[PDB]
Amino acid sequence: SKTIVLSVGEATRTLTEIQSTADRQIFEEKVGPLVGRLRLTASLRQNGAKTAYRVNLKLDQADVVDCSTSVCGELPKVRYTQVWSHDVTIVANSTEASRKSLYDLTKSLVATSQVEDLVVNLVPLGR
Amino acid sequence: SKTIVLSVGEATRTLTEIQSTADRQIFEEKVGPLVGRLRLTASLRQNGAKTAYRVNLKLDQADVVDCSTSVCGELPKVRYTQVWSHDVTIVANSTEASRKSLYDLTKSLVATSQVEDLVVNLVPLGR
């Protein structure tokens, strides 16, 4: 259907569209076990009286564990669950240059080393 | 506009459309003096509750007289007026063969010598 290729550095992951709907788009990653994998929820809507819009993007990935390699008998069981949602409130009558600058600033803040340290070492952002 | 050619035997007369309208079509003959000439009125309509139709065809021709050839002063003045109207009440859901037979019978009755004698000598139809 709809395929999305993501480059991690040495391997390429493929996400496939599974629940094609306007108000809710569900992309699932196809690698092996479908249960407890990478899922992405996308939603687009309006607000108020036709003024602006609302975009929601959530990315979930639950780790799985299995004991069939050593223990006699244990089905693949999920462990923890991670939720990373978003919220985009951009009005229609805006500015293309301003939107591009905002996207570039967001990309720079994501690619910077401060957010990576905040995520890994749990140290508050402040360098 | 719309021209109609009628053959009388030795000459050809031309009638021209003048008042193009759906509910009333007025054809006038163009030969010389437009006032007091040959006129034809056609009308088409429905009836009741969409059942049949109604067609009306009238043909008028008023003779004119003039004294400018001998007398000093006399404008062309109309004399008598002749009115020959019609009435067609044919339903839609009929028969093409029956309509053709009726038209042929009407044409034969018109072209027969009895109606000509009834018109000329004013003798009642009965030969």
Next chain:
Amino acid sequence: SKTIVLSVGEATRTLTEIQSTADRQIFEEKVGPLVGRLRLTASLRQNGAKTAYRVNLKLDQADVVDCSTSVCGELPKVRYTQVWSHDVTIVANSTEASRKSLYDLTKSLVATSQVEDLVVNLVPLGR
């Protein structure tokens, strides 16, 4: 349709038939904006008891204004309206030579310089 070419001296204007009807003929000039342009209304009828006739000819032209060249929002708006109607009451049984002489006299009175001054400088006709 029906096209009418008018020569103003250096350019040629084209009027197109819009509302083809017997009792009301509406010609409209096609140059650019259709609203607020040159329109011509023609009508022909009879009178009394099939004695004479009646011809009516009206010519209208409303000027338009627009501010989109400088002001940032103004639709084309009409200003004033000019009405120039006519009335022709010529009997059928007349004289071709008399009608031609009358038409020539009217053309001369229209092309004379006195009516032009009366129209422009608003000075009463009397030279």
Next chain:
Amino acid sequence: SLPYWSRKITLECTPYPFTLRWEGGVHKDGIPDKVPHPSCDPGSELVSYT
């Protein structure tokens, strides 16, 4: 729908006239009145121009 093509090009500028002027004359030895017509009158001439 049918195919179609066209093109356009224009060039124009707005007109705007203006004027420039300048006057002068010969400098004299101690003449306090140097006009288009020097009011004074020493001993020589002053051509001037405007």
Next chain:
RNA sequence: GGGGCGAAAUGGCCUAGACCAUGCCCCUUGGCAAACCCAUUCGACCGGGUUUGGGUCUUCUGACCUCGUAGUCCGCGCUCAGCGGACUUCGACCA
């Protein structure tokens, strides 16, 4: 409470007629669809409160997005986008 009725169910009046008694017909308006808030097993749990709901520019007249409603000519061709397109009107939180 505010009305209706003598019709319609009968009883007085009861050629006819128009009024009477119980007696029977309606209103107690209604709906918004979203977003957020509490104490806690320190959310699962039902219930409540607040901000919005055709919308802006001068939401003054008047226009600029949208549509809904009609009437009128309409193209069987001219325009770079094209197109099927024109003009005038009333309404626009919902039954």
